[PDB]
Amino acid sequence: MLGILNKMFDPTKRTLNRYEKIANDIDAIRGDYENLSDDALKHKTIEFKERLEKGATTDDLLVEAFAVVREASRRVTGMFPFKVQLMGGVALHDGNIAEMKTGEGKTLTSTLPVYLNALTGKGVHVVTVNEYLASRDAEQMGKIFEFLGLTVGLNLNSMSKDEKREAYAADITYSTNNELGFDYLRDNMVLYKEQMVQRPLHFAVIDEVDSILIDEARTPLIISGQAAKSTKLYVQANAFVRTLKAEKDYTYDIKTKAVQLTEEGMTKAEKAFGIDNLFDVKHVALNHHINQALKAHVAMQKDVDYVVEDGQVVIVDSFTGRLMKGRRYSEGLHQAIEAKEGLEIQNESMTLATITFQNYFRMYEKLAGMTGTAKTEEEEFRNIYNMQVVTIPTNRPVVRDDRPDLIYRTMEGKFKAVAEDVAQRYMTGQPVLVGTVAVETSELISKLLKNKGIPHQVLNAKNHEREAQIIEEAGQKGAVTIATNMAGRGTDIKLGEGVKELGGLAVVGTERHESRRIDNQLRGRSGRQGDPGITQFYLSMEDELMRRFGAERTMAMLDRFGMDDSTPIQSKMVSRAVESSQKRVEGNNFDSRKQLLQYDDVLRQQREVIYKQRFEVIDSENLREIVENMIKSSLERAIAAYTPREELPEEWKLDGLVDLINTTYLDEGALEKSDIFGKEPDEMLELIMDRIITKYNEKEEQFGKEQMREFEKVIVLRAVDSKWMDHIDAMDQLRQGIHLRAYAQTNPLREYQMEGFAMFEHMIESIEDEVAKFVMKAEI
Ligand SMILES: Nc1ncnc2c1ncn2[C@@H]1O[C@H](COP(=O)(O)OP(=O)(O)O)[C@@H](O)[C@H]1O
């Protein structure tokens, strides 16, 4: 609830002039390295490392470091970065967004501050959108860093949990956004601390930062795959519809508890499966399901504070009436859904880890970013991520002709018009690139060109390697490309022999996008480095962004403002109005990603807690914190079990409270002062501590350097398994289709926080039984 996003914050043009000066300072010492030997140069890396630790700052050696990388580059790649690029680096070094246009040299610029900030040995992460663009940048700029005496590392989805660590080991590491997200999450599902692949998140430099932080924001990162030896076993758990005498366990208190089972059930239930009463021989599975299925019949019921069907189960609110869409029953009460009544089964995928890129990337101590289009959502870059967008003067003045939208009346005429324009361009031999929004519209224009027999290339948004090769050749004479929205990103389109003289790459958008950012991106592909190029969008009156005008009629003027689909139309007015629709569409998207951020935030805080607690259960032998924790978890279960079977009218009739003790914690001799034995809550501390601590001491004596072993595979499991994976899944469920009546979107923020901390309070409690019961009742 701090400030409010999109309103206003600090400046430009004190920041730029400062940079300018720096660049010119860089050029000043340009001679100090130019005739230096190769060895003397490499030595600078060391010299910098020595200076930094002795007391100097990154900022203190900027001019120079940058000057060294510049000279290096010129010697390794052939390219001596321009002042505009030098400026870029500063923009990034300040943890800002460097906005430079397509064809400007971002990757080069990234080496500059990447180097500077990699000298600490803390590491640096150079982020791109996809595998290929990493591997490439890694392989090409790899050279320049290595030359200065630094380790480059490439992180891919293929690599072993070993090779990955070894890459995060490198001074500099390259990766796709996703892996960075994944590797983090996977690190927090680990059984031994080594397995983790990541180091502390120091610095991140996203290239194409808009796609990553603005567009790909609206998806969470999900991990899924379920292995509860599920569907099959749930039917089998439900085989116990009959003779629920010997195992029809005791009743309970508060929200829920059926755990206990008389010896006669267990044994014979177990012979119906084939082992003993399970101790922690991958047994947990059967005990938890049998409890669940046993509960689904007696404990949790039908038609009052439990379930109502449709074809499946929907939690209700017995007093309000309405169906709580999106509410999963904790730790696998699918049992109700599936077999108790109607085979409405439910088990496929399972969410095991979730994160937003806005939370993930905010974990880093420093974020910097690069892209051609990022002045638009600037109020967000500085309000969500604390980065100012710097707009960087191009190296060479743009001589492109971004033409005013042409407006046809219907799809067909607009499409036909697109064909014609490509038709004319091929015949001239001028290369054409056609931006599309949808694979299906991508296909239609191709057919249009297949009837006209105009050789071309479609570009589907997938298999990036091929399309990169395609894209270089889209700047050659007679080239014809049609690029699915987000196709060929990251690659320059270099114009061919004498293509300059035909006007350069001509670009044709088949429609304006959900965001002017995307709109300008398209135009971007054309005017790089001061080559000519023309860009033009086509719009039909016949769709979205154009509804403003559905119901428009006239008194004395040309009705519809572009009639009969003969020719096109132009007016600033209509184009102006398209902007509204665009900007309004941009609004929705902001809101939907704000809400996501707001949803993950609940998870974020929830998850940092559990992550921290898990790892602590892993570093558990010298303080005997696995027993100290196991002791707390036990004392909870009691204090909770004790204080309901004793309300404020009366602490009375101890009989089920007796059962509880015996078939939850301790053997038959779970009776003492049978009932009405005085009457206290804190009498329960002594008497249950007695029968449990004495037993724990004796349980840990017969087989005791192992019980530590025993707790660990008990605690960590039940924590990991029922709690986290079931919460994570159940959460993503509520996030999803919390679309029951009487909620408004992102107000559910209110319901979500509420129902999701409720859930957590419980899941923590479920953990607390699981561990107490098992330590006490699982024997060889
Ligand atoms: N200073 C330079 N000298 C020579 N060539 C350059 C220079 N800067 C960039 N280039 C070339 O122009 C292309 C554009 O640079 P790039 O790093 O891709 O930036 P952008 O992503 O803005 O296009 C690259 O393929 C590179 O080979």
Side-chain angles (χ1 to χ4, degrees):
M1 313 152 87
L2 292 188
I4 293 178
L5 32 218
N6 280 335
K7 246 190 246 175
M8 185 162 75
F9 188 3
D10 293 6
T12 192
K13 235 104 121 321
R14 206 200 161 153
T15 296
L16 239 186
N17 283 280
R18 182 208 139 195
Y19 292 171
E20 259 211 80
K21 192 215 125 130
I22 286 162
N24 296 301
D25 283 340
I26 292 164
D27 209 28
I29 62 172
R30 106 217 160 216
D32 274 359
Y33 306 87
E34 180 183 28
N35 47 108
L36 225 52
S37 66
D38 272 358
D39 301 13
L41 196 47
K42 192 163 174 165
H43 204 44
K44 294 286 177 189
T45 283
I46 310 146
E47 202 187 289
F48 294 162
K49 295 182 168 166
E50 272 188 338
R51 288 164 64 173
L52 288 161
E53 201 179 354
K54 298 238 167 203
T57 82
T58 50
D59 319 279
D60 278 349
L61 334 159
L62 200 126
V63 178
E64 307 188 31
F66 265 6
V68 165
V69 174
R70 205 186 185 195
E71 177 63 42
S73 175
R74 161 65 224 174
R75 292 197 214 190
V76 171
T77 51
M79 340 162 176
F80 198 60
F82 316 93
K83 298 193 184 146
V84 286
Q85 327 207 246
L86 310 168
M87 276 183 255
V90 197
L92 309 145
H93 178 268
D94 287 340
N96 296 324
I97 301 263
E99 166 171 282
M100 312 171 301
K101 293 280 171 175
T102 297
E104 279 303 311
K106 300 192 204 66
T107 295
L108 210 52
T109 305
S110 79
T111 70
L112 278 167
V114 174
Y115 174 82
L116 185 50
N117 298 277
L119 298 179
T120 30
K122 292 169 194 175
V124 182
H125 299 252
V126 175
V127 205
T128 200
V129 305
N130 74 46
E131 303 282 283
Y132 163 81
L133 288 182
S135 310
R136 171 199 85 170
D137 287 5
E139 167 92 59
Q140 296 190 341
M141 312 276 81
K143 286 186 301 179
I144 186 183
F145 295 126
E146 305 194 310
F147 169 82
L148 293 180
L150 281 157
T151 44
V152 184
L154 177 62
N155 168 37
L156 302 185
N157 185 271
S158 30
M159 299 167 90
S160 172
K161 279 217 190 179
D162 178 331
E163 307 153 13
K164 266 174 177 288
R165 192 173 306 99
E166 183 58 348
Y168 282 100
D171 305 308
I172 296 156
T173 307
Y174 280 75
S175 148
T176 82
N177 44 323
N178 293 274
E179 280 314 286
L180 279 168
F182 292 138
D183 294 343
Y184 172 81
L185 295 173
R186 273 178 265 141
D187 277 15
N188 302 255
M189 286 157 90
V190 166
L191 296 164
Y192 317 95
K193 295 202 138 182
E194 71 128 307
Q195 291 189 9
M196 303 184 46
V197 306
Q198 292 199 331
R199 288 201 270 161
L201 301 166
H202 181 39
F203 187 3
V205 173
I206 313 71
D207 148 41
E208 296 292 359
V209 66
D210 23 316
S211 307
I212 284 179
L213 285 175
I214 306 284
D215 307 319
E216 300 231 285
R218 309 113 100 221
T219 188
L221 266 96
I222 295 102
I223 297 273
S224 31
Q226 146 88 46
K229 269 223 172 177
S230 314
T231 307
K232 304 77 208 163
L233 186 50
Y234 290 132
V235 202
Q236 298 184 52
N238 227 256
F240 292 98
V241 190
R242 300 190 180 180
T243 300
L244 48 27
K245 159 193 183 167
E247 95 271 5
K248 207 202 167 162
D249 51 33
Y250 226 97
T251 164
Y252 56 82
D253 312 333
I254 300 170
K255 311 159 202 177
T256 194
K257 184 179 175 182
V259 149
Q260 76 261 124
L261 210 78
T262 323
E263 311 163 21
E264 208 37 271
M266 301 205 72
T267 315
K268 286 177 170 168
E270 279 298 318
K271 209 210 177 184
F273 279 101
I275 269 169
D276 298 62
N277 308 312
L278 342 192
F279 137 123
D280 197 344
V281 166
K282 287 186 186 184
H283 275 330
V284 135
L286 300 180
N287 245 219
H288 187 93
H289 289 166
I290 281 161
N291 255 323
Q292 292 299 295
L294 179 80
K295 300 190 180 180
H297 290 267
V298 204
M300 293 283 196
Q301 255 227 35
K302 177 195 187 172
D303 257 359
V304 179
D305 190 15
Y306 299 112
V307 286
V308 149
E309 330 148 14
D310 180 293
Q312 297 108 62
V313 324
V314 197
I315 291 180
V316 276
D317 184 4
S318 176
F319 188 58
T320 200
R322 60 155 203 176
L323 333 148
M324 294 303 94
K325 291 192 155 174
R327 272 185 167 176
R328 270 277 138 320
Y329 258 113
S330 73
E331 17 134 339
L333 265 186
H334 325 145
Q335 298 272 15
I337 324 225
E338 296 152 358
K340 190 214 172 188
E341 43 187 330
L343 212 266
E344 326 295 73
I345 208 129
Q346 42 157 230
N347 193 293
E348 341 122 311
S349 83
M350 217 223 299
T351 293
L352 319 166
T354 160
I355 201 164
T356 48
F357 294 113
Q358 310 103 349
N359 285 333
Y360 174 68
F361 280 113
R362 273 199 288 161
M363 304 229 30
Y364 290 84
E365 270 287 8
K366 198 187 219 186
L367 254 60
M370 297 162 283
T371 165
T373 55
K375 200 66 166 210
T376 10
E377 225 71 327
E378 142 166 75
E379 312 291 348
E380 211 177 311
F381 286 135
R382 173 89 113 158
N383 156 250
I384 300 268
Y385 302 110
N386 197 53
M387 308 165 72
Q388 326 167 20
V389 168
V390 187
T391 311
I392 302 199
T394 56
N395 175 248
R396 297 172 71 190
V398 186
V399 285
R400 214 179 56 234
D401 217 49
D402 307 304
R403 298 304 287 148
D405 301 318
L406 312 164
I407 311 144
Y408 286 79
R409 203 205 159 175
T410 56
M411 289 299 205
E412 296 303 301
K414 180 182 86 167
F415 288 136
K416 269 168 261 189
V418 164
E420 258 157 53
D421 200 15
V422 199
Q424 320 205 239
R425 306 281 183 186
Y426 180 129
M427 279 188 276
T428 28
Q430 193 198 27
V432 209
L433 170 72
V434 178
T436 293
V437 148
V439 276
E440 63 284 339
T441 320
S442 263
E443 235 51 274
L444 193 279
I445 305 299
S446 57
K447 283 192 173 188
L448 285 218
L449 293 198
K450 275 176 208 299
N451 281 282
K452 293 188 184 204
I454 284 149
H456 68 257
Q457 285 296 73
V458 154
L459 283 186
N460 48 76
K462 47 212 195 188
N463 176 225
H464 300 96
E465 192 138 45
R466 195 206 54 189
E467 332 195 312
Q469 301 129 30
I470 307 291
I471 239 213
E472 301 182 4
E473 317 308 284
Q476 293 299 319
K477 194 184 286 185
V480 192
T481 332
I482 145 175
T484 298
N485 153 0
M486 73 163 36
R489 276 199 174 138
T491 327
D492 294 48
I493 298 191
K494 285 203 152 177
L495 322 177
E497 180 76 12
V499 169
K500 237 99 175 271
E501 346 228 316
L502 282 163
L505 179 76
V507 197
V508 170
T510 50
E511 63 193 331
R512 291 261 229 123
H513 313 101
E514 291 213 293
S515 175
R516 285 168 292 184
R517 272 210 346 282
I518 300 187
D519 277 351
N520 307 306
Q521 220 158 87
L522 204 54
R523 314 199 170 94
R525 331 215 71 174
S526 194
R528 54 176 288 315
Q529 292 313 351
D531 309 347
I534 63 211
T535 117
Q536 177 88 62
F537 283 82
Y538 289 72
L539 294 148
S540 85
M541 258 301 298
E542 205 192 52
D543 251 351
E544 300 284 77
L545 286 190
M546 212 83 52
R547 342 205 83 183
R548 262 284 163 205
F549 295 71
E552 165 144 41
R553 288 293 147 163
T554 276
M555 294 222 77
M557 284 205 82
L558 237 52
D559 156 60
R560 289 318 180 182
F561 76 63
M563 78 184 65
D564 75 339
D565 213 5
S566 187
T567 54
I569 249 288
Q570 287 179 4
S571 183
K572 277 152 199 187
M573 161 184 52
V574 198
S575 288
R576 270 204 204 89
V578 171
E579 287 214 33
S580 277
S581 308
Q582 291 226 26
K583 230 288 190 158
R584 270 176 297 119
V585 168
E586 294 181 33
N588 294 251
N589 298 328
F590 172 96
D591 304 338
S592 299
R593 93 182 81 106
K594 192 199 171 167
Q595 85 173 314
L596 188 48
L597 185 54
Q598 289 179 100
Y599 280 29
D600 213 51
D601 258 280
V602 192
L603 281 79
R604 170 186 231 168
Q605 168 205 1
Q606 224 156 26
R607 78 176 163 255
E608 303 293 298
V609 166
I610 299 324
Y611 288 8
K612 281 214 183 216
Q613 204 177 70
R614 275 188 74 251
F615 298 90
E616 202 63 51
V617 178
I618 283 173
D619 316 340
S620 71
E621 319 193 321
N622 300 320
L623 297 170
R624 177 203 27 180
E625 63 208 20
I626 210 147
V627 172
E628 152 143 19
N629 300 320
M630 125 214 201
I631 307 263
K632 287 350 167 327
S633 297
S634 327
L635 187 33
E636 219 78 317
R637 230 14 157 146
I639 199 186
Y642 274 127
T643 301
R645 299 257 175 179
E646 300 180 0
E647 171 67 297
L648 248 171
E650 278 166 29
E651 317 196 311
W652 258 260
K653 65 140 285 152
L654 157 70
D655 246 311
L657 199 56
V658 167
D659 168 302
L660 146 121
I661 299 167
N662 54 258
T663 34
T664 317
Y665 313 105
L666 62 226
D667 308 335
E668 168 192 15
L671 204 40
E672 265 200 74
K673 20 230 116 160
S674 36
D675 90 326
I676 286 147
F677 50 106
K679 41 187 194 146
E680 321 214 59
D682 293 339
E683 199 177 344
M684 300 14 283
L685 314 179
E686 137 232 316
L687 255 208
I688 219 185
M689 180 51 145
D690 277 33
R691 242 333 228 205
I692 283 158
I693 201 81
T694 58
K695 199 234 254 45
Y696 132 72
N697 284 173
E698 86 188 29
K699 229 296 161 61
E700 96 144 57
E701 157 201 19
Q702 283 178 6
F703 299 92
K705 308 189 175 179
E706 298 173 356
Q707 200 109 117
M708 288 340 99
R709 170 276 198 197
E710 220 261 321
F711 316 136
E712 208 164 337
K713 212 54 214 175
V714 171
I715 309 258
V716 181
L717 141 93
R718 293 261 101 240
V720 164
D721 269 13
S722 109
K723 111 84 157 283
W724 200 213
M725 322 275 89
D726 282 325
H727 196 92
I728 285 320
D729 191 75
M731 269 311 209
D732 216 354
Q733 181 87 56
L734 255 178
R735 177 197 295 160
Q736 205 98 328
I738 175 154
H739 290 349
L740 49 167
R741 246 59 194 202
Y743 294 40
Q745 300 180 0
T746 302
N747 204 190
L749 189 268
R750 273 269 167 187
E751 229 113 357
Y752 199 68
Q753 43 168 234
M754 273 212 35
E755 286 176 27
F757 273 123
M759 305 174 119
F760 201 64
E761 279 178 54
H762 299 297
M763 180 229 52
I764 283 158
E765 305 180 325
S766 210
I767 299 178
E768 300 187 275
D769 182 16
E770 286 151 358
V771 325
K773 175 201 180 173
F774 275 62
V775 171
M776 298 275 84
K777 283 305 167 61
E779 215 158 42
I780 45 164

